[PDB]
Design a protein around this nucleic acid. Sequence first.
RNA 1: GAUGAGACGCGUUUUAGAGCUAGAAAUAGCAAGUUAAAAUAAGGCUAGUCCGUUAUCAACUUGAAAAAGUGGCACCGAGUCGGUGCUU
DNA 2: CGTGATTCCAGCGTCTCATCAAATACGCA
DNA 3: TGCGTATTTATTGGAATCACG
Length: 1360
Amino acid sequence: DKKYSIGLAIGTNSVGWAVITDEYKVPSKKFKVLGNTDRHSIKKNLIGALLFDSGETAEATRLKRTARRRYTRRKNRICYLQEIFSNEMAKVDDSFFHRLEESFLVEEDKKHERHPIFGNIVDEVAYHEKYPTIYHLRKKLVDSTDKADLRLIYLALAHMIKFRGHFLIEGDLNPDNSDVDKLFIQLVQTYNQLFEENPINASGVDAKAILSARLSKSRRLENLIAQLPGEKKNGLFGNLIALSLGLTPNFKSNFDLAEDAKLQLSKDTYDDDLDNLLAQIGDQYADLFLAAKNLSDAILLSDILRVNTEITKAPLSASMIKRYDEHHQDLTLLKALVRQQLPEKYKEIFFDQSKNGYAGYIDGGASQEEFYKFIKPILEKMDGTEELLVKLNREDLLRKQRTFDNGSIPHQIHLGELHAILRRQEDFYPFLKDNREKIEKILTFRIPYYVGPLARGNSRFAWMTRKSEETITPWNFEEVVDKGASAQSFIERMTNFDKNLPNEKVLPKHSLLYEYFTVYNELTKVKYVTEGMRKPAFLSGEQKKAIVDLLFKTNRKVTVKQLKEDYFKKIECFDSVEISGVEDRFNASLGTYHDLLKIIKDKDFLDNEENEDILEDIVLTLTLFEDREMIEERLKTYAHLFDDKVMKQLKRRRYTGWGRLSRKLINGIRDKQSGKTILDFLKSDGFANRNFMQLIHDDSLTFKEDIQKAQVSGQGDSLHEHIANLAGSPAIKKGILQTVKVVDELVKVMGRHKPENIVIEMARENKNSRERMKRIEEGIKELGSQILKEHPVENTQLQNEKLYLYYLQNGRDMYVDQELDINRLSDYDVDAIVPQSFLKDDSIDNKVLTRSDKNRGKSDNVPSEEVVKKMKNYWRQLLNAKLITQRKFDNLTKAERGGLSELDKAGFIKRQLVETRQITKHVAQILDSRMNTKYDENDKLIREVKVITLKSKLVSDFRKDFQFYKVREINNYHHAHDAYLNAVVGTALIKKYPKLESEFVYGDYKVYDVRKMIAKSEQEIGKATAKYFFYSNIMNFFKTEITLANGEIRKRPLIETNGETGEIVWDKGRDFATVRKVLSMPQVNIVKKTEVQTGGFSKESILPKRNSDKLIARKKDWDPKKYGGFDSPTVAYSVLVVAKVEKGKSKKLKSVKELLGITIMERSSFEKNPIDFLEAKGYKEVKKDLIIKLPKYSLFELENGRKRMLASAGELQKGNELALPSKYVNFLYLASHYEKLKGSPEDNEQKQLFVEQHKHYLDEIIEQISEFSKRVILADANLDKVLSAYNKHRDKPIREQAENIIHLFTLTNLGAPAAFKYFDTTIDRKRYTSTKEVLDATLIHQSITGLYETRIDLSQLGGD
RNA sequence: GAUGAGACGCGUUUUAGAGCUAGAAAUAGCAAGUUAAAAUAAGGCUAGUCCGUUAUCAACUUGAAAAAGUGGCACCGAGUCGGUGCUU
DNA sequence: CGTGATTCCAGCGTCTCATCAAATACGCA
DNA sequence: TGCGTATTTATTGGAATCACG
């Protein structure tokens, strides 16, 4: 019971735990079993694993929330449009909007005429005959000057507002500029007139078809550059073309500018950057930029609308009418040609909705792509369809007006069409003339991203602040929403608070206070020595002020030489001085001060300390906002101190990034006794010159005490809140929370005794043959070799490591100039550049293909320096072709030096011991805080529980070297097994090397890993001395013998004990047997975490009308039998009810008991009042006490070990684990991994001999699977088919049969049934669609660890 | 990458879009086919251009809810955990 | 007439704007 | 040379359908 340890394995879908003792034994304890059964106690081994679904992200929820908000706002836009038209529409037709709102209802449910637009059959038919589409009506309203019906005008405006296009372009977009040729020629002429010394020729360049083609952006750019003579990708006119296409070039090096100001047109106003540029370059660029703007508009418009704008003022309605006319003509031609040539297929094409024909393209679910793919061979087979096929090649055959590619239409086109309609119709309807502005605002209004939801303090996503409390509308939005405050909260609601003080916002990165603090902190520790003086001394306040004034303020960058010369000789009159504490140049620089001096040109204003806070606000404004107008609005407060030109210059400048410390730290806190802030202490601290870290960690000052006292707010908050603040995927956070709860429960298990040690290992989350072939080809081409031409090779064939190295090594040995043969791969060997006794490097950087074994020349160290000198030129040739990396080249060439130094072994042990990931560090912090809570009275932490972080590499090497193989397809026990091994390794490490604690164990322990660890070239005595081991390997003490290089083996003592304390750490004669017995234990606490299902109500797909009760109504008044609806609801949790239901026409009461599925939609109604919900469902006289809530994955034990996990009200899942013997697992791993098994060739031969001599294990495993299936699975057909398939392929090789058996293990796996394959036979899944059996089984409530159980006998809870 | 916020195109259903000719009707033949309104998780109250799909979740005793509490040891073994003895 | 046994199937693309953080690869005092 | 910094980042119910004897 005393001195136990806990090992854990954290994963995205599993958390394995194992409690071990000092002797590496897993205890077994009697746990009391609660409930109403005859069982009172059970025996449980303290090892197991918790299984749960992956933690989903909120991305889908966020997208659905945005979709809901957008739908609500679109409906509100339609409501506003109806509000504008309410009185006039009521004058014309009072029920028009009512018919529009009830158009969805069937004729029976309609309270008005079934025709929405006109209310009568004749007028509706006339409208649809005159206007086949809405675009015909839109074009008619745009062009015709006759008075139009109000209903048609409203319909056009509603279509425009409801579908208004994107807002990716700022400013107006005139649709007339559609002729690409004329505008391109004009831009070419302007460019030639600008740079007359560097003209270009545009003759024979039809840019319209080049840029308007349905091709890639970069492809079209390259084609246009190639077409233009003397034009390149980076050419200035090419830069203008890229700007039109969507790039952001500049004109710095183009013989004009001295800085790198950039201008872009697709974003922002663009009317201020252009003016600023023209202020420098005059009016020369005005015509060129006008032509560039025209071409940029034309490039978009030509692809958006091909129709010329001279004919009509609505180029989008005209384009859609052209689409309709082409569709009609092509449809008639296709009908005629098909009826003429292929009449038989005509019946299918135009009537079979199930096929991807025209009927399936229009009335069916087939899309444009599917329709084209189906009808292209038919068109090619026929004759006279050449034009139709040409149209199909351009994806312009039988097109619809509402297609998937209408997302490139900007809102400017719809706005222009709406404006044209309002201009035409304002003369007849005065209210249209009055509300034209309101309608345009409705169409063009878009909530700024920095404003967010327009809530009123009842939402957890909103941050908007209101100047006044009133209903927000587009017409008064700027009059209500505080845009500046909204953007300030938008930026600051997600920025990090100060590390020391959590209640204060952090300062901007480029704030003057931050830069001054950094400069003073850096100058605090600077020391200077002169020849005359004896001892180095710090800089005084006056000296630092003079240095800042003369160096940091005069020049942006300050160097050590500049400090020595420009100040000490000019002011201090010191000819020579040696300065320590700064190298090359200072890291801190007053760049913001220089920028402000350049902008405002006011030395006094910047130097004045009174104006400093105003600057702290100005820089905060510049960092906070990026919109020019709101930046000007925020700077209006300080606009009374600077001129309009200075204000504009400040507006144009931008800053990004945030600092790490707040003003409350730098100057917000003052020492009680001295009355000085951190900055004040940095300015003058006597001669000690304490830096920021010393100031915040000084007992003589109240800084640390005040920081801690203000840090108690939020200190030790809820565990869930702390885990949520961590950085990582939500699944990993769920795993961390489950691990912490498992640790707490395990501590509860052991009598409230904290474990001596805790070990953790978080598995890292998250074709290549073609990449390897590409790399080899690039290297060969760069080096100029032609070995690839001599010997053909394939991408996949390079997957073999030996052949991959062979092609990388120029078909030669890496150490010997002799050639190599592909046929003799077995005759060749793979050797590690750094020996296995020095590093566990299994990558290509370490593996090398060598024919011989003694050709290295040096066994202990890196191969002999003579071979290195011989192969240096060839290795350099390989490096120049990028066939190898630089680090492996250095490792190979280290034979030039004396050998592998202690730095290499220190790096190796650092690599092998600790993980660089910070998520494991945060998990260790959480565990240490929750376990080590006692505080020593000496201001120290009582580290009574050690938290160790181990890499998966160590456990994997342990398994692959000591034959503790794992197979993930057998069962989930491997999870727990890994945890156990982790614990063992961790304990076996910390007992073996107590002086490396700070390497792995979480804590502020002393650090020494260079001299005290690595010994001299003394294998026999180096380990015996204070040095741990000459070899850098961490787990070499586990093995009995260690192979040094190739061919020679050294021997270690059979019992490994600590050198200093003398404690026995590893008994190789007993510990291995204990580990084998632990891994062979059949009883492992595998727990599937029961979860109430959350998410969507049902399938989002809306099914058509159907006379079935499985459909879910989309709305309260919409009967699914007439309007369709959703189906396939998701059950959050089942409910076991014991009640009676009326049966027969006599309504006799009969006792019943069954599981009722409570869906996500009905969860709230059931939880509000279960009795009424059950009565509505049909049950009568429900017993509330016997109502049992069963979440998903609820465990039931029926009989003879059969365990079923509840998955729904009408389906179960397999809930048993197959405790396959470890011998079978090892045999399967060896046989399946017949190749690439790694290790010495003798070991590989021994493993192959074992596999060949234990072929009967295949039949034994088949019999085991059959027995387990008959005992638990009870899948007769699947088991019979598996047996037949196994008997059919008994003559297949051992590796294939082993892999097929691994696949066959899917039948008996835990969880939902799944289909698998045995060679070519495909076995499906037997689904247990009956939940009537679990009503008489034994329900099991399992705790998180599963040791604490409660068995409820459901047979007792029966009405009979 | 995670979290947020603004938008866009669709997609899907019901109805409108008269299908016509002949044929007792069934049914044949021919015609048309592009579009539109409504909804897009049921809905809730706080009534907002708000919120409704993330996370949390053995059971029992509590505690509104958070949260808390609720369960001999050792030994031999082992087909999913059993027995042996002590305490209990 | 349940009773298995079989089959099909499941909303989805495109932009903008932040913020943070760890991950990875140098910088540096 | 560790702290510090500059950019980059198919599954499993459900429903229907199909023998089906």
